[PDB]
Structure 1
């Protein structure tokens, strides 16, 4: 009679919270989805072993189209768990799932876990300074999306930082690297000439947040465009004007050029 939306956190099977794990262990059925994001530091087998329960994986279609036919029926007579990477309900379409639960007479509870939205605080950039967020999508066929470029422009114009999620093909298991994001942004700049993203733009790359050994790098595009940030997932941030404390952290922790202490503050 109860559905639990439980977040798995950032990188591996240990990013789930104690509360999350204990609740998942008491559930009769456990579902999971890995299309909003993957867990690069673990496997379904490791998550299953940790929880001590078989996990049924659901596709985007299973969820978006049949959530009430696959999950809710079981949540009517049993305790059911729905696992997702990061913090539940952060993914745009997930909140609506609670409406479906209510409509079906199912109670639902949300057990939080670390999210990239808060984990980016490890870059040293002040969280309050982040503006609207966006996703960099691969152009395709006759479709060349560029809204994320405008997001950066409006945020930076107000001295705000921009968090950029990079495209991911869940099933195809392929992620857009920070390097590819930069190349794409450089292309959009040549098309819009807005002076928003260029070789001299300062950027921060965060890779494998959640891991005990994440990659945090800050610098100008011209110098980071071909650098190796390691395995995915990657997240790209275009900061707005920096507070001196943000700058110092980037230099001392993210190996940024001392030059940002005079150019970007």
Structure 2
């Protein structure tokens, strides 16, 4: 009669919370989805071994078209877990699943875990200064999504930072790199010419948040566009004007050039 939405956290199998792991271990059935994102620092086998029970992975279609026929039936007479990368319901499509549970007469509870949305605090940027967020998707065919450019523009003009989630082709395990995102943004700049993203734009890259050794780097696009930030996942942030403490953290912890202290503050 109960369905638990359990977050797996940021990077590896130990990023789940103690609460999430203990609840999952007591569930009769464990399902999971790995399409809103992936857990780059681990494998399905390692997560399965930690929990101690077999995990039934659902595809995007399984969830969107058949969640109520795959997961909910068992949740009616058993305790069922539905694992998701990060924090449940940060991904926009998760929320509606709680309504489906209600419709099926199934109780649902959410077990939170770290999300990249909040983990960016490790960049040293003040969380309150983050404005609207956006995702940079891989162009495909004649589709070159670029609304994120206006998101950066609108946030920056109000002195706010912009968090850019980078695309991940989950089934192919293809992660968009900060380099690829910067290249796309420069192309969009060529088309819009709003002076929003250029070689002189200060950006912050966070790779493998959750790891004990994530890569945290800050600097100008001209210098970072071809830099190796290591294995995935990557996110990119275009900060707005900086508080001196934010800049000092970027310089001392993220290796930002001293120039940001007199250009971006």
Counterpart for residue 92 of structure 2 = 92
| Corresponding residue SS for 1:14 | coil
Give the distance between the partners of 1:88 and 1:16, measured in 2 at CA: 11
Counterpart in the other structure of 1:135: 135
Q: CA deviation at 1:190?
A: 0.6
- How far is 1:138 from its partner? 1.8
TM-score (norm 2): 0.99
Alpha-carbon displacement from aligned partner over 1:189-217 (angstroms, at most 9, x marks no partner): 01000000000000000000000000000
Displacement of 1:175 in angstroms is 1.0
**What is the distance in 2 between the residues matched to 1:210 and 1:219?**
22
2:113 is the alignment partner of 1:113 = yes
Give the distance between the partners of 1:208 and 1:109, measured in 2 at CA.
28
- How far the C-alpha of 1:93 sits from its partner, in A, is 0.5
Unaligned runs of 5+ in 2: none
Note the alpha carbon deviations across 1:135-182, whole angstroms, 9 max, x for none.
111222222211000000000010000000111111111011100100
**C-alpha separation in 2, matches of 1:163 and 1:262:** 23
Alignment RMSD: 0.5
Number of aligned positions between the proteins = 265
Instruction: Measure, in 2, the Cα distance between the counterparts of 1:86 and 1:137.
Output: 19
TM normalised by structure 1 equals: 0.99
Q: Tell me the distance in 1 between the aligned counterparts of 2:41 and 2:140.
A: 29
Q: Which runs of 4+ in 1 moved over 6 A?
A: none
CA distance in 2, matches of 1:181, 1:116: 17
Cα distance in 1 for partners of 2:69, 2:116 equals 31
